[PDB]
Structures are given as C-alpha cells and as structure tokens.
C-alpha cells in the first residue's frame, strides 16, 4: 500500500518519516553527505503547490528502504521545510529534462 508512488517505487509515510528525519537532522547541523551535498535547498522552479511554508530542502528517499547515506541519490526525493514539515515527495521519473514531477 503506497502512500506515495514515484515511478515504480512504493513509499509509505513511515518510509517518508524516516528519510525526512535524517535529512532534517543534517540540515540543522549545517552538514551535507554525498557528492551532491544533500540536504540542499529545493527552489520549487516546478511550481508545485505544497501546503507547507518555504524554504524547502530536498533529501534522497531510497527505493531500497534504506536511509540515504552518501552514494547515489536515485531519482526520488523527500522535500521538507525548516519546521520539519513534509512538503511532498518528488521524482525525476516521468519528468522531462532535469525537472521533477510529484509522487502520487
């Protein structure tokens, strides 16, 4: 039962909660991991209608169930704000160029 579906990936919100929590922790600390330095600001160039207030930050969500720990970010991301609220779940899967679509 998919709370969020990114392409073929099935995410529950515990799955989300867990990804989120780690990214949020590193955001707060002023540190990043990976060659892409996650977490980092998500601009919302795509213009998604998130309810949550900005600034937004993106952190990879792993199809593997595993919390991102520095390798490939994959195509999926968790977006959260400074108050640590979940903004949405987006993915490169299904989007053209280097844009993102929302996970459903």
Q: Residue 16: enclosing H or E segment and its boundaries?
A: helix 13-29
- CA dist 22 and 24 (Å) reads 5
The only residue of 5, 44, 63, 93 in contact with ligand 2GP, by rule CB under 6 A: 44
From 1-9, 11-19, 39-47, 70-78, give the range in contact with ligand 2GP by CB under 6 A.
39-47
CB-nearer residue toward ligand 2GP: 12 or 85: 85
Q: Map tokens 């390798």 to a residue.
A: 71
Rounded Cα gap, residues 30 and 37, in angstroms: 11
- Is 27 an annotated catalytic residue? no
d(CA 101, CA 29): 29
Residue 12 or 73: the one with the smaller Cβ distance to ligand 2GP is 73
Give backbone dihedrals phi and psi of 86, rounded to 5 degrees, phi first: -75, 120
Shortest Å, Cβ 60 to ligand 2GP: 12
User: Rule CB under 6 A: which residues touch ligand 2GP?
Assistant: 40, 42-46, 98-100
Residues noted as catalytic: 40, 58, 92
């Amino acid at each position: 039962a998919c709370d969020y579906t990114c392409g073929s990936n099935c995410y529950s919100s515990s799955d989300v909660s867990t990804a989120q929590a780690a990214g949020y922790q590193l955001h707060e600390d002023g540190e990043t991991v990976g060659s892409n330095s996650y977490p980092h600001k998500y601009n919302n160039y795509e213009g998604f209608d998130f309810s949550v207030s900005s600034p937004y930050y993106e952190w990879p969500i792993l199809s593997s169930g595993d919390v991102y720990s520095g390798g490939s970010p994959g195509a999926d991301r968790v977006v959260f704000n400074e108050n640590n609220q979940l903004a949405g779940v987006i993915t490169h899967t299904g989007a053209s160029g280097n844009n993102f679509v929302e996970c459903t």
